[PDB]
Amino acid sequence: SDFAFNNWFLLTNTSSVVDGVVRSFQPLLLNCLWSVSGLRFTTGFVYFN
Amino acid sequence: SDFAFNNWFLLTNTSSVVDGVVRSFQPLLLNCLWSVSGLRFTTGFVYFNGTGRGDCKGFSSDVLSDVIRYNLNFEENLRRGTILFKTSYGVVVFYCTNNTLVSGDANFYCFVNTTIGNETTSAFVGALPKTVREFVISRTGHFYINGYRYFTLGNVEAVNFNVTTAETTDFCTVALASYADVLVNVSQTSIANIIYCNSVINRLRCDQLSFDVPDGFYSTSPIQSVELPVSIVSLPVYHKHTFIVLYVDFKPQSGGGKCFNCYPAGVNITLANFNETKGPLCVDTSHFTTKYVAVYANVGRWSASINTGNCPFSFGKVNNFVKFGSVCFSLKDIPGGCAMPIVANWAYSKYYTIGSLYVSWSDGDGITGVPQPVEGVSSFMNVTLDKCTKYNIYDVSGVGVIRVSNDTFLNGITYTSTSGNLLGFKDVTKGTIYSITPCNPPDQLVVYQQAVVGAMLSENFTSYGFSNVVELPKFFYASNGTYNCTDAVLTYSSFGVCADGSIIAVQPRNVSYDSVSAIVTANLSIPSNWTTSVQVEYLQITSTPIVVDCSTYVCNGNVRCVELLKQYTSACKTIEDALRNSAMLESADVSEMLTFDKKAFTLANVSSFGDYNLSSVIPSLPRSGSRVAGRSAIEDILFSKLADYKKCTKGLSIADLACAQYYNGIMVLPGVADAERMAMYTGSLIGGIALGGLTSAASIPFSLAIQSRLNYVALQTDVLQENQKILAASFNKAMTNIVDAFTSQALQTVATALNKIQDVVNQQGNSLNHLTSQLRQNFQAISSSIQAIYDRLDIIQADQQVDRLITGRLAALNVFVSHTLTKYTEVRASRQLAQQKVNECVKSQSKRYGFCGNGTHIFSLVNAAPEGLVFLHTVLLPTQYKDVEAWSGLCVDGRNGYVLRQPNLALYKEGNYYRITSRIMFEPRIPTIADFVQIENCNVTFVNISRSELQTIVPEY
Amino acid sequence: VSQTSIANIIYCNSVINRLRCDQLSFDVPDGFYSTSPIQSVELPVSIVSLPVYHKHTFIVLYVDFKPQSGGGKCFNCYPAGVNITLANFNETKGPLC
Numbered sequence A: 001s002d003f004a005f006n007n008w009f010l011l012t013n014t015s016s017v018v019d020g021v022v023r024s025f026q027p028l029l030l031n032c033l034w035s036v037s038g039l040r041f042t043t044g045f046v047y048f049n
Numbered sequence B: 001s002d003f004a005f006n007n008w009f010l011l012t013n014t015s016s017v018v019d020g021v022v023r024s025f026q027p028l029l030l031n032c033l034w035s036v037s038g039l040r041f042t043t044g045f046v047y048f049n050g051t052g053r054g055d056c057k058g059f060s061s062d063v064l065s066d067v068i069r070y071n072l073n074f075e076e077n078l079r080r081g082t083i084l085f086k087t088s089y090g091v092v093v094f095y096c097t098n099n100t101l102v103s104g105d106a107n108f109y110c111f112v113n114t115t116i117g118n119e120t121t122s123a124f125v126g127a128l129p130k131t132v133r134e135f136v137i138s139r140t141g142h143f144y145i146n147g148y149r150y151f152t153l154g155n156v157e158a159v160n161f162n163v164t165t166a167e168t169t170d171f172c173t174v175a176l177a178s179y180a181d182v183l184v185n186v187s188q189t190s191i192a193n194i195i196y197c198n199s200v201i202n203r204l205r206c207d208q209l210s211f212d213v214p215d216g217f218y219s220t221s222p223i224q225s226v227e228l229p230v231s232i233v234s235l236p237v238y239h240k241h242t243f244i245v246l247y248v249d250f251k252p253q254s255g256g257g258k259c260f261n262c263y264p265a266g267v268n269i270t271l272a273n274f275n276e277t278k279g280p281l282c283v284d285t286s287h288f289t290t291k292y293v294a295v296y297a298n299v300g301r302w303s304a305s306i307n308t309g310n311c312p313f314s315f316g317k318v319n320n321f322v323k324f325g326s327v328c329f330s331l332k333d334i335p336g337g338c339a340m341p342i343v344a345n346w347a348y349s350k351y352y353t354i355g356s357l358y359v360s361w362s363d364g365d366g367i368t369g370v371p372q373p374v375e376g377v378s379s380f381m382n383v384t385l386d387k388c389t390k391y392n393i394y395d396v397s398g399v400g401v402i403r404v405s406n407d408t409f410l411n412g413i414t415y416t417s418t419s420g421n422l423l424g425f426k427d428v429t430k431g432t433i434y435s436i437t438p439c440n441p442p443d444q445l446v447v448y449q450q451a452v453v454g455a456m457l458s459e460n461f462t463s464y465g466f467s468n469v470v471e472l473p474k475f476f477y478a479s480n481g482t483y484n485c486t487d488a489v490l491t492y493s494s495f496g497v498c499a500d501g502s503i504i505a506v507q508p509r510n511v512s513y514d515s516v517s518a519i520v521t522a523n524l525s526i527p528s529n530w531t532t533s534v535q536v537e538y539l540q541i542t543s544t545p546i547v548v549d550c551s552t553y554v555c556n557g558n559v560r561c562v563e564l565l566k567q568y569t570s571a572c573k574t575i576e577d578a579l580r581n582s583a584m585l586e587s588a589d590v591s592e593m594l595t596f597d598k599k600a601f602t603l604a605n606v607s608s609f610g611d612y613n614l615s616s617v618i619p620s621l622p623r624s625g626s627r628v629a630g631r632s633a634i635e636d637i638l639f640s641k642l643a644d645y646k647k648c649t650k651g652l653s654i655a656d657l658a659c660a661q662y663y664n665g666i667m668v669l670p671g672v673a674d675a676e677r678m679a680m681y682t683g684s685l686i687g688g689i690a691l692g693g694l695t696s697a698a699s700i701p702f703s704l705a706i707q708s709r710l711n712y713v714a715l716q717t718d719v720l721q722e723n724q725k726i727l728a729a730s731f732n733k734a735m736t737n738i739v740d741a742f743t744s745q746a747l748q749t750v751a752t753a754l755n756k757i758q759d760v761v762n763q764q765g766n767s768l769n770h771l772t773s774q775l776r777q778n779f780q781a782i783s784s785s786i787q788a789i790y791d792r793l794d795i796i797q798a799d800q801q802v803d804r805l806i807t808g809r810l811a812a813l814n815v816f817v818s819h820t821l822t823k824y825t826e827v828r829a830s831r832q833l834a835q836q837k838v839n840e841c842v843k844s845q846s847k848r849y850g851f852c853g854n855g856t857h858i859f860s861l862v863n864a865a866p867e868g869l870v871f872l873h874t875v876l877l878p879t880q881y882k883d884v885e886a887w888s889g890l891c892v893d894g895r896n897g898y899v900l901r902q903p904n905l906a907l908y909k910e911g912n913y914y915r916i917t918s919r920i921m922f923e924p925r926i927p928t929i930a931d932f933v934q935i936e937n938c939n940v941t942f943v944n945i946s947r948s949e950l951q952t953i954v955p956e957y
Numbered sequence C: 001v002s003q004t005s006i007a008n009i010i011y012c013n014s015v016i017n018r019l020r021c022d023q024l025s026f027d028v029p030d031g032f033y034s035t036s037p038i039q040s041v042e043l044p045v046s047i048v049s050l051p052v053y054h055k056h057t058f059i060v061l062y063v064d065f066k067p068q069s070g071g072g073k074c075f076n077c078y079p080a081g082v083n084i085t086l087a088n089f090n091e092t093k094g095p096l097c
């Protein structure tokens, strides 16, 4: 809790709602905390693993 | 205006209405005034041109005439005539022979023969009219005699009228005309007058389906009706095209010599995309422009073209911003797919189709038809800014105007309202966003004395010819008159409008009232002689019960329908059971409320009253009939200002509207409040005023009675009673004033009651006026007529499409019953209140403030009215006040202080002597010792008097 | 969401959170609510029919697409796609019911 997540966005095929309360399905599993710290051009191939 | 137009008729394909008000499209353009004056047999050929040998009068544009109307003014005699119609395909003539022989004379036989090219054909007139008063024809070829249309010819290039009349006063008119939108008033199916829908005020009037709309507020939307610039916006992706083109090359050998619909040299029609394997060709690149392609060399009068099929999307419009998941267009048949037919016409007379374009499709967002043929690596995003336009933005279409805004809103790309209409969008390029305001928001306008005045708007502009647009909070307002604030002729809670349209802020009702008169041993004022007034109220008392027959209403007499319904008797029983039980309940109540007194009914004779002359209220005597009573004057005036089935199975008249309802199955029961016992009740109540408890049964003068009622408020103490004689002159005058008002706030009160009565009557009628209309529409069935449904189908698939009718009808019926119960359960409250106040005010003066009138109450009259009562609360209002100087108590020389036995009295020093008066009237009463009471502790604030001068005030000793 | 931008979220895991999310709000006022907790797994299947000694009919179809790979020229070209049929066809070929 208290995470700003300013960059983090919703996902919608249709027109986005504004300033509302909505329950929905989102891809929000923490999974790997970062997994990209110090990202460089040779990021390698990750395949849903 | 004022044109009789007795011959002139309506035009209707379907059954004609009778004696109604209807707005419709009619060919009523004056065009050439006459154009046929002095008509002779050589009338010539006129072809929808100004080439008419007549006085046009110069009001005729002479551009074109959609239709030709012939008006005949001849005696009712038969005169030889012929009709010639000229068309490019053929010439058709109409002839009739009076004599029996087919040739007859140049038993009546009429033959119309039509010849095309060198071929001559013979046609059969069949039915021949006894008399024809009007003739109608049109360019489309519709043929109308006396309004109805017998048949429609394919086309008419020109019309020639072969009518020969020896009479010099041959006929009245043969003219040309054009369509227009008008309104009409019809009596006995015959026109009376019309109203052109051109001006704004006339537009509103026609919209009202009436004339003379009452002064008030209405809403209107003025809309532009012209082409507007078109704007498009899509996501930029470098266009990769796909062209689907088809090469129909009908090229027959003319087809007019043997057959056009025989498909000669009709053969190959194909598009290059067919595969030797002939797998269905579905495009892959999203952007494709479908086009019809070139057409075969075209010869005169005939053509071929594509027709709309059964698919959702019409071919040719597909390119107009459509979506698809997989086109898969194929030339041969495709399993489970829609197909379209191409047909050819020979002068719009032969129709021959060809199996063409099997298409099946999946829905999707990848493929999209684009109108613009050019597709490539280019930059385009046309966007007109500040005008009304069409638009397509990211596959959403509409019309409106675009406004630049300043809002970051980088979360997404499209914003839509709760309704589903988009509000604004953001450009992909930069980040600016634009709103989409609608072109024509509704405007609120006002009308008064059958002309428009003033207007509530949204834009700071003078849309109409109004000369001023006063900005006001929450809205703008136009007006054409100066502001002088003289008065208001219309009003709403916030504000009222002037006669010329000037707006004014309302000042609430200046009034004044009274309150407790605290004893303070100081100057105070008591009310003097009053003046009379009358207030009117109205109470709803009853509702006209209605009953319904389930099986008639839905079955409508079909035995098979009745049998399919037979399994639903569990359902519809509840409806009629509820309606019937509620009706008998309420009728029992209203019959329990109405009492009667023969002792007092006789007293209603006007001779018993006196100067009051309440002639209107008293019931009328029987008109040489054995009827107990007759309605009073205010009664028939009210009814004036506002059938037997015995004649609905028998008789020679056409059925009336009410009669029709019985046939359908609704049935309005006779009203509970019948006039006989209603009038007896009202008369008995009125006679209960002049009757007082006496050993004998005789009456006493009405004057004494009022005095007694006054005593209730306080002990009237005067011997020469000026009030009895003064108030009557105001009373009878007020009554004459108010009956004139029927035929000063009291006036607005009467206006409110009248408005309420017409309100309840409209509210009652339009309920079943809404009910009986819903069976005319078929929810999902082929047609409403059950009998027709049985005719059109066999036993297995007829009942299946039948039952969905009754499945809807029962729902509508359950809605109706559930709203009738909600009318009864609420009117019961008004009944409670009415019975609660009639027995209170009508019988015994109330001491409750504000229940019987503005001020102190003396007596109240009652009369009947449609489904309700009306009261006449006579009251008293203070003309002037008399001031006086008082003392809050008394102190004897001894410690004891005296006070009064009840508060409503008050001492004062009238002169040398002291007089104690009532608090509510200026009547004075003598002092005495019995009117006081003792309390030890003396307050100095009271009169200070010793035992000596006590003997001077009260004779103690 | 404020100005189309996220502010905070609530995982719908606990029973109380489940009810709260169902309320389309936060902090539902103290009171009474109704809920249905439902099993979400496969359950044994039971059948019952009128006993009649079963006489069978087998309808079987033999689609044998077998194309020559299809990745070198075309897969949707129906190569060696041909015969797909079920033994029940009649020389008269009356519909088989």
Ligand SMILES: *[C@@H]1O[C@H](CO)[C@@H](O[C@@H]2O[C@H](CO)[C@@H](O[C@@H]3O[C@H](CO[C@H]4O[C@H](CO)[C@@H](O)[C@H](O)[C@@H]4O[C@H]4O[C@H](CO)[C@@H](O)[C@H](O)[C@@H]4O)[C@@H](O)[C@H](O[C@H]4O[C@H](CO)[C@@H](O)[C@H](O)[C@@H]4O[C@H]4O[C@H](CO)[C@@H](O)[C@H](O)[C@@H]4O)[C@@H]3O)[C@H](O)[C@H]2NC(C)=O)[C@H](O)[C@H]1NC(C)=O
Binding pocket: A011, A012, A013, A014, A025
């Ligand atoms: C924009 O529009 C696009 C349109 O495509 C939207 O994308 C679609 O979004 C829907 C909804 O999220 C999505 O359906 C879901 O798919 C995922 C993945 O499916 C595979 O995972 C399941 C396991 O969950 C595996 O069994 C299998 O690999 C699934 O694939 C199969 O899908 C069906 C159903 O499972 C199978 O029968 C097929 O054979 C196929 O192989 C699923 O996670 C999700 O599954 C949920 O519902 C199903 C059906 O009731 C259920 O069986 C699952 O168990 C699960 O239900 C609940 O179970 C989890 C257990 O952890 C529990 O935590 C939750 O309660 C779950 O709800 C469902 O099938 C669809 O695939 C997307 N489209 C495509 C083509 O990918 C996009 O979301 C839109 N974006 C917005 C919102 O704007």
Ligand SMILES: *[C@@H]1O[C@H](CO)[C@@H](O[C@@H]2O[C@H](CO)[C@@H](O[C@@H]3O[C@H](CO[C@H]4O[C@H](CO)[C@@H](O)[C@H](O)[C@@H]4O[C@H]4O[C@H](CO)[C@@H](O)[C@H](O)[C@@H]4O)[C@@H](O)[C@H](O[C@H]4O[C@H](CO)[C@@H](O)[C@H](O)[C@@H]4O[C@H]4O[C@H](CO)[C@@H](O)[C@H](O)[C@@H]4O)[C@@H]3O)[C@H](O)[C@H]2NC(C)=O)[C@H](O)[C@H]1NC(C)=O
Binding pocket: B011, B012, B013, B014, B025, B140, B179
């Ligand atoms: C009995 O039943 C018969 C059944 O056939 C009824 O006959 C039909 O009546 C309807 C309604 O009147 C009639 O539709 C009207 O046709 C006339 C003539 O059409 C031609 O004129 C227009 C110009 O107005 C030209 O553009 C062109 O020549 C028209 O022909 C074309 O029709 C459509 C639409 O225009 C075209 O797309 C086709 O390509 C075809 O060539 C029209 O005057 C009338 O047009 C009005 O509506 C259209 C469509 O919205 C609009 O585009 C027009 O501008 C016009 O709308 C308004 O514009 C005028 C401008 O002066 C304005 O003053 C009014 O507000 C207009 O309303 C419409 O198309 C139909 O053709 C008749 N049937 C046939 C086959 O002829 C008969 O009326 C019934 N009788 C009753 C009442 O019982």
Ligand SMILES: *[C@@H]1O[C@H](CO)[C@@H](O[C@@H]2O[C@H](CO)[C@@H](O[C@@H]3O[C@H](CO)[C@@H](O)[C@H](O)[C@@H]3O)[C@H](O)[C@H]2NC(C)=O)[C@H](O)[C@H]1NC(C)=O
Binding pocket: B185, B186, B187, B192, B193, B211
């Ligand atoms: C709608 O059309 C009807 C039919 O013309 C109009 O009603 C007719 O109105 C006239 C007056 O406009 C009535 O005449 C008056 O009748 C009385 C009683 O007979 C007579 O004493 C008067 O001297 C005068 O003739 C006529 O009775 C009436 N007829 C019918 C059948 O209604 C109606 O006014 C029209 N309304 C509009 C808004 O155009």
Ligand SMILES: *[C@@H]1O[C@H](CO)[C@@H](O[C@@H]2O[C@H](CO)[C@@H](O[C@@H]3O[C@H](CO)[C@@H](O)[C@H](O)[C@@H]3O)[C@H](O)[C@H]2NC(C)=O)[C@H](O)[C@H]1NC(C)=O
Binding pocket: B510, B511, B512, B513, B514, B744, B745, B854, B855, B877
């Ligand atoms: C009961 O209601 C009626 C009508 O609302 C009241 O009648 C009116 O009483 C007011 C006093 O509140 C009178 O006002 C004054 O009139 C004089 C003379 O014109 C004027 O000089 C004053 O400045 C003030 O306007 C008004 O004339 C009178 N109108 C009528 C038609 O009678 C009545 O007073 C109400 N009674 C109570 C107890 O509220």
Ligand SMILES: *[C@@H]1O[C@H](CO)[C@@H](O[C@@H]2O[C@H](CO)[C@@H](O[C@@H]3O[C@H](CO)[C@@H](O)[C@H](O)[C@@H]3O)[C@H](O)[C@H]2NC(C)=O)[C@H](O)[C@H]1NC(C)=O
Binding pocket: C001, C002, C007, C008, C026
């Ligand atoms: C739903 O999301 C909105 C957006 O964040 C929440 O509203 C925001 O709530 C904060 C406090 O949680 C408000 O801040 C307070 O505002 C006042 C007045 O400016 C200020 O004096 C306080 O110090 C504090 O900053 C903020 O105004 C408000 N903004 C908006 C646009 O609503 C809302 O509370 C969230 N609700 C839930 C249940 O998560």
Ligand SMILES: *[C@@H]1O[C@H](CO)[C@@H](O[C@@H]2O[C@H](CO)[C@@H](O)[C@H](O)[C@H]2NC(C)=O)[C@H](O)[C@H]1NC(C)=O
Binding pocket: B465, B466, B467, B480
């Ligand atoms: C509203 O005001 C306008 C002008 O302020 C009035 O207009 C005149 O109307 C006649 C009749 O159409 C025209 O011949 C004049 O040219 C108009 N004058 C102007 C300056 O436009 C109009 O009559 C007024 N209408 C009402 C109902 O008040």
Ligand SMILES: *[C@@H]1O[C@H](CO)[C@@H](O)[C@H](O)[C@H]1NC(C)=O
Binding pocket: A041, A042, A043, A044
């Ligand atoms: C990423 O692309 C760059 C050129 O844009 C290239 O030099 C580099 O090798 C690429 N990275 C990998 C891991 O191949």
Ligand SMILES: *[C@@H]1O[C@H](CO)[C@@H](O)[C@H](O)[C@H]1NC(C)=O
Binding pocket: A047, A048, A049
């Ligand atoms: C991911 O892990 C699974 C399980 O070991 C494995 O099958 C798969 O090959 C891994 N991913 C890749 C890209 O190899």
Ligand SMILES: *[C@@H]1O[C@H](CO)[C@@H](O)[C@H](O)[C@H]1NC(C)=O
Binding pocket: B041, B042, B043, B044, B081, B082, B106, B162
């Ligand atoms: C009209 O018909 C009559 C015969 O009925 C014919 O004598 C006359 O010539 C016709 N009129 C014209 C203009 O041809």
Ligand SMILES: *[C@@H]1O[C@H](CO)[C@@H](O)[C@H](O)[C@H]1NC(C)=O
Binding pocket: B047, B048, B049, B158
């Ligand atoms: C009617 O006038 C138009 C315009 O001049 C013309 O094209 C047409 O030919 C005229 N009518 C006839 C029957 O010639």
Ligand SMILES: *[C@@H]1O[C@H](CO)[C@@H](O)[C@H](O)[C@H]1NC(C)=O
Binding pocket: B093, B094, B095, B096, B111, B112, B113, B120, B121, B122
């Ligand atoms: C009917 O048609 C026949 C054959 O074309 C023709 O001889 C006859 O005059 C027609 N009848 C008329 C024009 O009344």
Ligand SMILES: *[C@@H]1O[C@H](CO)[C@@H](O)[C@H](O)[C@H]1NC(C)=O
Binding pocket: B073, B074, B169, B171, B172, B173
């Ligand atoms: C109707 O016909 C008569 C016949 O003499 C004529 O006098 C009168 O003017 C005509 N009325 C019209 C055409 O309105």
Ligand SMILES: *[C@@H]1O[C@H](CO)[C@@H](O)[C@H](O)[C@H]1NC(C)=O
Binding pocket: B247, B249, B267, B268, B269, B270, B271, B272
């Ligand atoms: C189609 O038919 C026409 C005439 O039968 C012929 O000219 C044309 O070559 C045919 N084929 C195509 C592809 O148009």
Ligand SMILES: *[C@@H]1O[C@H](CO)[C@@H](O)[C@H](O)[C@H]1NC(C)=O
Binding pocket: B230, B382
């Ligand atoms: C779109 O904009 C271009 C540039 O002015 C113009 O040539 C073209 O006609 C416009 N298209 C439409 C449909 O107005």
Ligand SMILES: *[C@@H]1O[C@H](CO)[C@@H](O)[C@H](O)[C@H]1NC(C)=O
Binding pocket: B406, B407
């Ligand atoms: C920007 O937008 C805000 C609110 O949408 C508005 O108050 C302001 O006037 C706009 N213009 C500027 C220059 O801030």
Ligand SMILES: *[C@@H]1O[C@H](CO)[C@@H](O)[C@H](O)[C@H]1NC(C)=O
Binding pocket: B460
């Ligand atoms: C409204 O119109 C009047 C007309 O002169 C003008 O003076 C005023 O500035 C306008 N106000 C607005 C907000 O447009």
